[PDB]
């Protein structure tokens, strides 16, 4: 399953599947750490 992922050192998006890919790395700067991005959905917050 293709999932949207964000690298650690650089903020530009990386695409892969964790279940298949044995090795996780940003193929641009070689960073092993990734951020699961915030979904583009509305969030309701009470201002109190």
């Amino acid at each position: 399953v293709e999932a949207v992922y964000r690298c650690f050192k650089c903020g530009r998006e990386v695409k892969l599947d964790l279940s298949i890919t044995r090795d996780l790395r940003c193929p641009y700067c070689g960073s092993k750490i990734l951020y699961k991005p915030r979904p583009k959905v509305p969030r309701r917050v009470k201002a109190i």
């Binding site: 964000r6 690298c7 903020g11 951020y35 991005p37």
Partner: protein, 65 residues
């Protein structure tokens, strides 16, 4: 972090006055005179501007993405 919008004690809005106070004080003017000119007479309001730390600049550098 970032300057409080309102005085914690009496609710007077002091969010805008902080940058003016900072630049005027750095310019060398008397802090008491600057605070009087800005309109902060109660010492509760003067506490908010006098003791505030701009910590937003020091934490903006780390992103969560």
């Amino acid at each position: 972090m970032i300057v409080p919008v309102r005085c914690f004690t009496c609710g007077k809005v002091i969010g805008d006055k902080y940058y003016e106070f900072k630049r005027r004080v750095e310019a060398g003017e008397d802090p008491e005179k600057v605070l009087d000119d800005l309109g902060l007479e109660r010492y509760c309001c003067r506490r908010m501007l006098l003791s505030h730390v701009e910590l937003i600049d020091d934490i903006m550098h780390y992103r969560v993405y």
